């Protein structure tokens, strides 16, 4: 299985709605600094999932009208992404929030800030990973 182009951008036809899942698989590069997965709506970023290896954290935020909101960095356990290690990310959309699992285990919830779910119709992936699969 070859790698996807990076950055990878694709339309999510129909946008989001409760029960909608977005799955991503790949491998963190050996000396990765950071990578991100964005769910976009027009010129806004409804959800920015940003693992940072330099900061050893998983940052989540929203960018509306070019302004970043308040970051969410809370984690119930140790940073699950590891340099040079393969991973899977499952983003499940619900009515009130996005539920995110990593390597098959629930990690955190992100309450919707951009609530018109059907308008969140673009996926963008970038950064220090080798993207091996996307299920939209
Ligand atoms: Ni496929």
From Swiss-Prot:
Induction pattern: By toll-like receptor ligands zymosan (TLR2 ligand), polyinosinic:polycytidylic acid (poly I:C) (TLR3 ligand) and lipopolysaccharides (LPS) (TLR4 ligand) and by pro-inflammatory cytokines IFNG, TNFA, IL1A and IL1B in mesenchymal stromal cells. By IFNG in macrophages. Up-regulated in dendritic cells following infection with dengue virus. Up-regulated in Kupffer cells following infection with hepatitis C virus. Up-regulated in plasma following infection with HIV-1.
Residues annotated to bind a beta-D-galactoside 2: 48, 52, 62, 68-74
Taxonomy of the source species: Eukaryota, Metazoa, Chordata, Craniata, Vertebrata
Swiss-Prot/TrEMBL domain comment: Contains two homologous but distinct carbohydrate-binding domains.
All copies of domain Galectin, residue ranges: 8-136
Subunit structure: Monomer.
Full-protein interval shown: 220 to 355 of 355
Entry protein name: Galectin-9
Subcellular location: Cytoplasm; Nucleus; Secreted
Tissues where this protein is expressed: Peripheral blood leukocytes and lymphatic tissues. Expressed in lung, liver, breast and kidney with higher levels in tumor endothelial cells than normal endothelium (at protein level). Expressed in trophoblast cells in decidua and placenta in pregnancy (at protein level). Isoform 2 is the most abundant isoform expressed in endothelial cells. Upon endothelial cell activation isoform 2 expression decreases while expression of isoform 3 and isoform 5 increases. Isoform 4 decreases in pathological pregnancy.
Function: Binds galactosides. Has high affinity for the Forssman pentasaccharide. Ligand for HAVCR2/TIM3. Binding to HAVCR2 induces T-helper type 1 lymphocyte (Th1) death. Also stimulates bactericidal activity in infected macrophages by causing macrophage activation and IL1B secretion which restricts intracellular bacterial growth. Ligand for P4HB; the interaction retains P4HB at the cell surface of Th2 T-helper cells, increasing disulfide reductase activity at the plasma membrane, altering the plasma membrane redox state and enhancing cell migration.
